[PDB]
Amino acid sequence: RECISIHVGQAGVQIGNACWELYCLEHGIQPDGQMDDSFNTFFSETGAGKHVPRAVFVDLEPTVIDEVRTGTYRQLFHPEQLITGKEDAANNYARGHYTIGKEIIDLVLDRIRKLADQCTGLQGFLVFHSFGGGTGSGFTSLLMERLSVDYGKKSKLEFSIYPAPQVSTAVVEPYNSILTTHTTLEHSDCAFMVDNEAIYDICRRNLDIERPTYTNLNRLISQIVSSITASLRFDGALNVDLTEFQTNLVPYPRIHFPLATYAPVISAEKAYHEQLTVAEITNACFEPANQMVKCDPRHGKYMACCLLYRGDVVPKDVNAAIATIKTKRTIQFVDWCPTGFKVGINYQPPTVVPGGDLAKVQRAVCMLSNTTAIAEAWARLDHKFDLMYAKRAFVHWYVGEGMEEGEFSEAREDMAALEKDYEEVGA
Amino acid sequence: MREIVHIQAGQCGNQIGAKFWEVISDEHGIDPTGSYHGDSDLQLERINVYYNEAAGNKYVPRAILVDLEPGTMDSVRSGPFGQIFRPDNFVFGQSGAGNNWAKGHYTEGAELVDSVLDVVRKESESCDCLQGFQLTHSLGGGTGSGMGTLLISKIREEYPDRIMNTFSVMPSPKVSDTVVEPYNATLSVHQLVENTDETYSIDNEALYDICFRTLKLTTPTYGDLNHLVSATMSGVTTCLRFPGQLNADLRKLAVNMVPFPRLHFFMPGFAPLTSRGSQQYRALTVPELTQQMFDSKNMMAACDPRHGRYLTVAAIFRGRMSMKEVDEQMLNVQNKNSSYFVEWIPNNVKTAVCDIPPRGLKMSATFIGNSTAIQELFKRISEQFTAMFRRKAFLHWYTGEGMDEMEFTEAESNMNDLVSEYQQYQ
């Protein structure tokens, strides 16, 4: 029972650097590389008294790889695993997918293949990236296409960062997203999306961080992606493996776009004053402003929901919690799945980083929910894409790489088909 | 790893380039001789991007200086950081251009281009992977406007895939220190618009207005203006020079800033800029920095941005700061001034950040803007060129080097096409 966690782009490598410290603190692994089965999923055992993680950080520019090498987690990671390119993607899907990718995918595929051959209990892969930029779109699509053609049946967990409605970091983000999603629709088994302004607001209103940073944003994301696999890592009363996220949450082979959220989020002084029980966290996770994506769930319906709890929590109280949540009529479930709840529990409680913003909580829950609220976000993305497409804005960079307007039109009509499928299944 | 080739042409070009080398050497902690005495390992981590390693722990810059008189070379060699430059790179002729584009592009340019081409080829071969060619020149005068344009054309022919970046100073009607300056500008813009990928348009009167308004200096010389432009020249190149939470190289900012190949004439800016006596009475927080970035008077161009509309802008910050504050500041900036941003783009703003600010400042930023307001500065130079050209004034010197009036007519048509292109998207 293992799974390999690969990272692409500045967002991916920063999330990896922010999360592997949490993993090593959870498993008791010091940064030097030394202190039975709990760490076997993400860390190997190299000879005697030494570990190495099952991960690769790949990026075209070297500005992230050299600082990762010269940081503080130097002796923990393999020196050769940190793959570095030679040229900048420059927020260009075509440049990240075609010119610069082709000279390093030959090494990357061989490296993942040889490090997977020694493994035997690999359940799947999880890829960290961001379609809002160039590297995390182009190189991710390039690798996932030739990984799906080779393995195919093995599971792939996509973790992407998407732009806010009113805020955007780049200017070619809708072009990058609409281009890469045309390939992500068929090869990605399931893809969790995160919005920047939602995760800025979640630490503003609750955690009381007036001036947060990307490290503070990535800490709770690392907590989420560690809590989903905490069931595999540690024993539980009702364990859920990685195949549950494929089987239960993907009712159709192309409708595989769930939203994500977490609870409780609380500062140190507020933790001692607020009580921790299942009821308030269950009410807060379904709260619309508490989600990690700026979408209104009230406008749509929940197609499916998997609750994963951590800490000393009995089954009875969570059963009562989901019962009263079902009787609550503020939310609305679709008629095609009345039994739309999948509850699971792990005994190992959440951990806290020394000096981190998060506080010690006796119990926690992560809520990945499949719903139709993302249809509005996709329609918004297509609407803002069409305004620039009509004027042919930022098209000369793409066509000067090797592409044309044909695959732009195919991306547009594929997004239209996605909207058609979502409005059809939401009826 | 992503090395940069530096080339300097003309009097003002080599002056601002020397100041750029001085300030970045001070930031990296490089002695005037060439030895390293820095405190942070990050300075040495990316010293190879500009400086070549030499014996005795010495570092020599990858700089090319080319001038059509020995006086500029003597001055920059006698400057504070003149000895650090390579003696081999001091290529120069004997006779000056005399403020003639034709002499710089045909007669002496042809004689010196073969001398500089192998030198830039050797410097390109020395590094592992050239990223782009950064150049500094002046549309005014003959030397820069001819020789830098010819050098750009030959390097574009030799490397049609690499980035071509230029920090070009251009004239103004209120301050014009040359009689042949509209002619030189009209001839040089025809070559700049077709060959160069990126272009930062700088105006002297804009820097003078800056030094009057916010610096409040009593005796502003060219040294202050060199330090002013060197700040933005370092701000654009900080992303590849140091790590950052959201890095944006030259190609990364170019892809966001260049929506079409011709509309690549930017409007650089930098802040904070304040007097030494008024530093205590200012809060350096990011909202008061961001308002100064988008202030109309703070830009380094004489054009009024409120009279036009921004095609796209980019803000590269330096120093530890909150990404939420940067995001919400850019949000309210693009929202409250929606009339001054084009509606046919959802987000006209790019953001980047570096984690190591300049010495002596805790936070800083640079603004790079492409807007329709540059059409004013283009059309005033265009009509100034036309008024002199319509009676064939100041052309008997140009005809001596085999230059024809059809070339001037083609340049005028190119200027008309460029200003109409900028007027189309307004």
Next chain:
Amino acid sequence: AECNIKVMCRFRPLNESEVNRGDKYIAKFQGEDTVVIASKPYAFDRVFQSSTSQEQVYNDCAKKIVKDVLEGYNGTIFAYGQTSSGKTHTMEGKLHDPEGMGIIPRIVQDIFNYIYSMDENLEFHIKVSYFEIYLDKIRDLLDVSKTNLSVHEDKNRVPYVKGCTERFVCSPDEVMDTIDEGKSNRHVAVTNMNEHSSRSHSIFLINVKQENTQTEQKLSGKLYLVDLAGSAKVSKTGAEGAVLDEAKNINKSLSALGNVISALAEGSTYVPYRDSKMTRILQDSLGGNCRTTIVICCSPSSYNESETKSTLLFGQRAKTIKNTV
């Protein structure tokens, strides 16, 4: 004073690479004016089927264009479409075969026949040039020494090329020999989608000057025959290496042409011909005193249906444009 730019559409037979894969012939013809693809009508001036011969296509396309360009106006004939659409087979064809020869030798033969039929008093002077685009540089195919050419504005600010070997011709045999030499000097590459893939836009210009000794009347005409490359899909082609660098220039040129066409269709103020030199050369063609003709080639296979639709709607945008003739 005002004349619509004439648009023609052609569908070709299915190729060996398409029939063996099992591509369906989705092209459906409803008369000559309109063509239907998946219940989507598209109206043009004349639609040609797979069975239409080279002579039939030439007589329908460029028969009266010879009269128009000889009268005093300008003529520009050029092709558009995707890869493996048949642009080379339409325009170049088989030079040795009288039946399989394309449009360009037939045009020269018609010009010479008209000159022979016309009386001897009207003196003619024909001069040809042949060049192409590679690495964003204009290569003159008639001389190997030159690697880049410049485009300069004439007296009335019409752009045209300079420095090319303007070969003054008198008989058709030397014209055909020069065309064969240019074709031999043309660079071609082998790909999965096409063997003799034309990886560059080839321009063939014929300046015909004429003067009447009796009336002392002079007339000049620039005849452009431009065979453009097809928009190559990277997934379908499997392009890697120098073919990618060729595709960069090809896609830049066709994207600039499409931007010009969209600007002219929507009625933009500036009409950016300056996006590329390939767009600058056709300034007089698209917005001058020229009676332009454009042919779009479409593959009837279901595999290339998306780019077929893109070419059809591109022709629809191009049809509404009017020139200032």
